Amino acid sequence: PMFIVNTNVPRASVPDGFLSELTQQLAQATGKPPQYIAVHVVPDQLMAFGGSSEPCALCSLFSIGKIGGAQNRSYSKLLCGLLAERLRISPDRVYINYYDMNAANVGWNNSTFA
Amino acid sequence: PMFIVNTNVPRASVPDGFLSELTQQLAQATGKPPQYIAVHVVPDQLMAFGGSSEPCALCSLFSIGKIGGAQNRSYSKLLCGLLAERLRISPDRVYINYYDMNAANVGWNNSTFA
Amino acid sequence: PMFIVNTNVPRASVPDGFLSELTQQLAQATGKPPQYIAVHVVPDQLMAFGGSSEPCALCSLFSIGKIGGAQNRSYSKLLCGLLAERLRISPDRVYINYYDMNAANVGWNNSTFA
Numbered sequence: 001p002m003f004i005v006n007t008n009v010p011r012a013s014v015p016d017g018f019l020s021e022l023t024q025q026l027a028q029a030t031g032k033p034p035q036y037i038a039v040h041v042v043p044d045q046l047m048a049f050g051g052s053s054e055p056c057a058l059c060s061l062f063s064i065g066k067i068g069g070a071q072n073r074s075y076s077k078l079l080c081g082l083l084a085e086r087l088r089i090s091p092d093r094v095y096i097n098y099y100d101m102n103a104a105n106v107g108w109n110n111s112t113f114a
Numbered sequence: 115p116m117f118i119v120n121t122n123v124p125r126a127s128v129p130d131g132f133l134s135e136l137t138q139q140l141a142q143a144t145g146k147p148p149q150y151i152a153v154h155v156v157p158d159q160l161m162a163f164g165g166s167s168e169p170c171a172l173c174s175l176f177s178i179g180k181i182g183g184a185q186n187r188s189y190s191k192l193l194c195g196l197l198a199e200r201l202r203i204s205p206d207r208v209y210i211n212y213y214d215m216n217a218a219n220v221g222w223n224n225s226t227f228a
Numbered sequence: 229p230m231f232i233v234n235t236n237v238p239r240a241s242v243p244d245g246f247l248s249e250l251t252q253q254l255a256q257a258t259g260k261p262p263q264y265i266a267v268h269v270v271p272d273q274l275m276a277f278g279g280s281s282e283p284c285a286l287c288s289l290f291s292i293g294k295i296g297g298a299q300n301r302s303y304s305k306l307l308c309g310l311l312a313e314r315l316r317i318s319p320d321r322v323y324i325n326y327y328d329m330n331a332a333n334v335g336w337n338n339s340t341f342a
Contacts, residue, residue, distance in 0.1 A: 076221030096221030107304030107324030190335030210335030
């Protein structure tokens with residue numbers, strides 16, 4: 001799985017340990033081993049949410065399966081919880097685009113996951 | 115909706131009020147309230163278009179519906195127009211990826227839009 | 229085609245000529261004219277792969293067609309090879325999301341490719 005968070009929160013406001021916490025919690029949420037979880041945080045971004053510049057986040061979660069209505073609600077509760085607790089972003093200023101990737105459409109290690 | 119613009123144009127060349135203009139024009143174009151429009155501008159990027167490092171942009175527009183053949187032509191005229199007028203990027207050096215997101219695949223406020 | 233590479237490798241470790249090499253190699257691999265190939269490299273990123281902050285890359289390849297099982301395996305060998313040779317990133321620390329874009333969902337030059 002691959003999780004990306006783009007935010008206007010400054011780099012100094014991203015706590016130590018955050019990439020590991022994301023890795024750990026996404027391994028548990030997705031059921032996939034942490035060795036397969038990739039995380040990316042992009043602070044200090046020029047962005048607006050609903051016409052204003054209070055803390056916000058625009059995010060992506062890609063997974064080969066483990067994507068669906070109930071699962072995505074669960075992911076959103078987890079991820080908005082983490083962004084609120086750790087980056088002080090209001091859950092109503094977070095968007096997460098979920099993608100169910102076909103194994104043949106994910107490259108890794110000179111091949112794909114097909 | 116979520117609009118992202120990645121460009122090699124420098125930060126100083128992004129006019130004050132550009133995010134607000136994108137928010138307002140996208141609210142009008144998509145018919146969605148401005149409260150639900152998110153915009154993200156990423157200047158100073160290491161990118162090339164056709165092998166050239168002249169000004170260019172690589173963009174994304176995500177919407178839950180309001181995506182289709184004719185609507186995307188209209189969005190492209192609008193957004194290439196704004197990038198030309200405000201960032202001096204030639205329309206033929208802009209790509210915009212359009213995505214028609216399923217409501218169940220968009221997280222927000224600890225849940226999804228489903 | 230549009231190729232994006234996000235990496236924790238520092239900017240100084242991205243060799244001169246890299247965007248041109250990516251453009252040229254992707255033109256040959258995809259069969260598309262180099263005029264239509266866009267490339268974007270984002271170094272210095274805060275990211276982890278498998279919980280580790282050793283060199284890694286999270287990438288995207290978009291194309292209108294020329295995406296599929298065998299083609300994507302071939303792209304992955306090419307792109308992992310270039311990232312290993314030029315950025316010293318292990319192929320097993322690269323993820324590439326492949327996207328087969330509908331021509332109607334790609335804006336360019338004030339319209340779409342439909």
